[PDB]
Design a binder for these strands. Structure first.
Length: 209
RNA sequence: UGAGCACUUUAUCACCGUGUCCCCAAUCUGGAUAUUUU
């Protein structure tokens, strides 16, 4: 890796991909979300932004190549703070609903979901010099994030093989997802490793995106 | 500052009461000597 930078945030939420009627969350963000956040923070606009019923139709032909890991310093708890969020009905969709048709989003119904009390992340990116330079220009050029790479090292994550039973692992995770018919991502489960030493090469994952 | 991203936990109201007591008090004890110049 070239260098890595640290950040923290008080509140966040990471929905499982089509969790269901009742939402849920995961202790750590997905790799795809982190990749998108880093791409946007550099000021790189999305490669494709066509419009229609849906979006996110992304070929890999023109897209930066890069390798990302993930880290974690302090465990955080979870809470549930919501009572309502409307939806789009399935069924008759009778009476007025069919009468209005104004970007409908009618039939408000109650539903709850989860939030994270606190969040802090440490990992950065292994990338060529030009990409890091333009990322710095996007951050500084024409909540809070800053590089403390060498000190302040904490635990990390890594894919797990059928041995060495881990503790408090993440149930599911996403690598590269497109909102269409596909095979989604291959590996789901991940395992945390606790040691104040540089993460192993297995922790680094070369992202296809 | 980008893609899953909505539209509210929403609107009202008394604890009624009433009601407190009488009795009382002790004692004893004291002291000694001492001034002179403008």
């Amino acid at each position: 890796v070239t260098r890595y930078l640290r950040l923290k945030a008080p509140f966040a939420a990471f929905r499982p991909f089509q969790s269901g009627s009742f939402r849920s969350t995961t202790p750590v963000p997905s790799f795809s979300a982190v990749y998108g956040l880093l791409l946007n923070l550099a000021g790189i606009e999305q490669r494709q932004e066509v419009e229609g019923k849906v979006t996110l139709i992304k070929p890999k032909a023109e897209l930066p190549k890069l390798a990302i890991a993930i880290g974690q310093v302090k465990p955080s708890s979870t809470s549930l703070i919501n009572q309502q969020l409307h939806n789009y009905p399935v069924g008759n969709s009778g009476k007025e609903f069919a009468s209005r048709t104004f970007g409908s989003k009618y039939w408000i119904a109650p539903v709850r979901r989860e939030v994270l009390v606190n969040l802090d992340l440490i990992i950065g990116l292994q990338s060529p010099v030009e990409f890091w330079q333009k990322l710095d220009q996007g951050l500084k050029g024409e909540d809070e994030i800053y590089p403390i790479e060498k000190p302040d090292l904490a635990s990390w994550y890594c894919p797990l093989e059928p041995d060495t039973r881990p503790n408090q692992g993440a149930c599911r995770l996403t690598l590269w997802i497109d909102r269409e018919n596909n095979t989604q991502t291959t590996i789901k489960v991940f395992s945390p490793s606790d040691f104040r030493l540089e993460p192993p090469a297995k922790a680094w994952q070369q992202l296809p995106g």
